[PDB]
């Protein structure tokens, strides 16, 4: 099972629009943003206090170099993919997600995936060790990358060695924020619309994102008639979720909500209290 993770998201577009620069690269440690490169600022910058305190100026300047270089690579890649797919001008997007995960067994899983205009293009994995092309256009890149044998060498070396070593470094840098446990604040809301009562169990501001929210009717689990929301982020770095059921108004008091979270000493039970 995944103990920790470090992954990066690259978004490059052929024509910038408001809120979408030419190129943005974002780093996440266990899902939390901690570094950002942006083509308008042209700088790699910290997004948390723990990474700013622990990194030396060489860390930020070397990655500014890597971000500046990637910015030119994606401009050429976008140009290259436009003809391979026989596409006209306008908004085109190249996406890359790469990183590694430290499993509980001590092993590392790593991958680097490219996408173009919402579909797979090319990917690399530590297990397979080979590039997977999604179509004939990506086969051109796969052939060139496999000949030189050098992309696969650099990719295996980053994903299997560099990435986890930086991840272990990042885990120690922000241990206090990464491993904090903030319990959710739970509230059950009820509204009767058109002869149907809608009960919603809301969970506010919890971290980390693992949580269980389940409705009970008497002694029976009521997951069958339960609609779950996503585990969505708040602006402060905590998460939100809900679990919703419909019920007869006259049976409102037979239902209760059970919530479990690593930040709670005990699982809490809640009900609608109008």
């Amino acid at each position: 099972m995944v103990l920790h993770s470090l992954h990066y998201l690259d978004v490059a577009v052929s024509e910038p629009s408001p809120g979408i620069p030419q190129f943005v690269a974002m780093g996440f440690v266990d899902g939390i943003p901690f570094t950002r490169y942006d083509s308008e600022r042209g700088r790699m910058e910290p997004l948390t206090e723990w990474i700013k305190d622990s990194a030396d100026p060489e860390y930020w300047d070397s990655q500014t170099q890597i971000g500046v270089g990637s910015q030119h690579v994606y401009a050429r890649s976008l140009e290259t993919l436009r003809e391979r797919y026989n596409q006209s001008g306008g908004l085109h997007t190249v996406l890359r997600v790469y990183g590694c995960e430290l499993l509980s067994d001590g092993s590392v899983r790593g991958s680097e995936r490219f996408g173009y205009d919402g579909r797979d293009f090319i990917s690399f994995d530590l297990e397979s060790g080979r590039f997977m092309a999604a179509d004939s256009a990506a086969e051109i890149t796969r052939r060139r990358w496999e000949h030189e044998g050098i992309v696969a060498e650099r990719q295996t070396n980053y994903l299997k060695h560099e990435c986890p070593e930086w991840l272990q470094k990042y885990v120690g840098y922000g241990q206090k924020e990464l491993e904090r446990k903030e319990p959710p604040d739970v509230h059950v809301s009820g509204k009767e619309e058109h002869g149907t009562l809608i009960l919603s169990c809301h969970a506010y501001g919890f971290y980390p994102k693992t949580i269980a929210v389940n409705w009970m009717k008497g002694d029976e689990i009521w997951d069958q008639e339960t609609e779950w929301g996503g585990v969505v982020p708040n602006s402060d770095g905590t998460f939100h979720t809900w679990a919703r059921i419909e019920a007869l108004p006259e049976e409102r008091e037979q239902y209760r909500c059970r919530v479990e979270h690593p930040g709670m000493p005990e699982p809490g039970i809640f009900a609608w209290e109008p």
Partner: peptide, 8 residues
């Protein structure tokens, strides 16, 4: 740490 993307 980031790594640079390769040309396609």
């Amino acid at each position: 740490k980031t790594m640079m993307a390769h040309d396609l």
